[PDB]
Amino acid sequence: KNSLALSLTADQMVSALLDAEPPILYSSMMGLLTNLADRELVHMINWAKRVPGFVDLTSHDQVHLLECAWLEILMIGLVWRSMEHPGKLLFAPNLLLDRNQGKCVEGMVEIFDMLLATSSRFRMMNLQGEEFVCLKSIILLNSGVYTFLSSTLKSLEEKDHIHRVLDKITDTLIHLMAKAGLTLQQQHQRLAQLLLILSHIRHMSNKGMEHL
């Protein structure tokens, strides 16, 4: 590579991610969600092109990452919006839903409870917006990386590049924590807690697809 992305400071990485953030959009229940998600996806495509390192990949690889990540990204967005609304999911400012409404749809209450659990966890952790954008990028680059067909040298160099950008996001995350005054022990602990939640996000996403 000649990647401008690998040369960014932590502060530059955050600013670029903050700049790239989509707006909050306004809203059958499946109909409402589908309408919303559809409109969100257009923003997501455009947002992904602005995640440092993403455009350095081939189109096949960009699309693979997006195909693998799109629901988790929708989901983490939802969770972040819902944080200051305990017991409720803020799909849109004009569409705030409690658990019991998840019931109207087959299999959805389970996914809703999971979404709510993730929201409280973030809430208990006092997740910051700067952390959130970092996590969302991680999901984009990480979710798909392990399932490109891994022969062609090209395909091999794409994975290394992704692993490097991710190490940059890790560093970025650590820097925010350091700047926020957290000790080293606290820094490594919070980093672990954050990344471990991504595994629950993956699960929610898979369960969702299975229900579908």
Ligand X SMILES: COc1ccc(N(CC(F)(F)F)S(=O)(=O)[C@@H]2C[C@@H]3O[C@H]2C(c2ccc(OCc4ccccc4)cc2)=C3c2ccc(O)cc2)cc1
- Please answer whether residues 116 and 90 qualify as being in contact, where contact means their C-beta atoms are separated by less than 8 angstroms: no
Give residues 118-137 in contact with a second copy (rule: CB under 8 A). Answer: 118, 121
Site for ligand X (CB under 6 A): how many residues? Answer: 21
Q: Is 203 annotated as a binding residue?
A: no
Q: Does 106 engage in binding with a second copy (CB under 8 A)? A: no
| Whole-number Å distance between alpha carbons of 23 and 113 | 25
Q: Does 178 engage in binding with ligand X (CB under 6 A)? A: no
Angle at the Cα of 45 from the Cα atoms of 42 and 48, rounded to 5 degrees: 145
Q: Which is nearer to ligand X, 9 or 35 (CB)?
A: 35
Residue 186: count other Cβ atoms within 10 Å of its Cβ: 13
Any long-range contacts for 102-106 (C-beta under 8 Å, 24+ apart)? Answer: 104/29, 105/29, 105/30, 106/211
Interacting span for ligand X (CB under 6 A) from 6-14, 42-50, 103-111, 193-201: 103-111
Q: Where is the binding site, in residues?
A: 40, 81, 211
Chain contacts with ligand X (rule: CB under 6 A): 33-34, 36-38, 40-41, 71, 74-75, 77-78, 91, 105, 107-108, 111, 208-209, 211-212
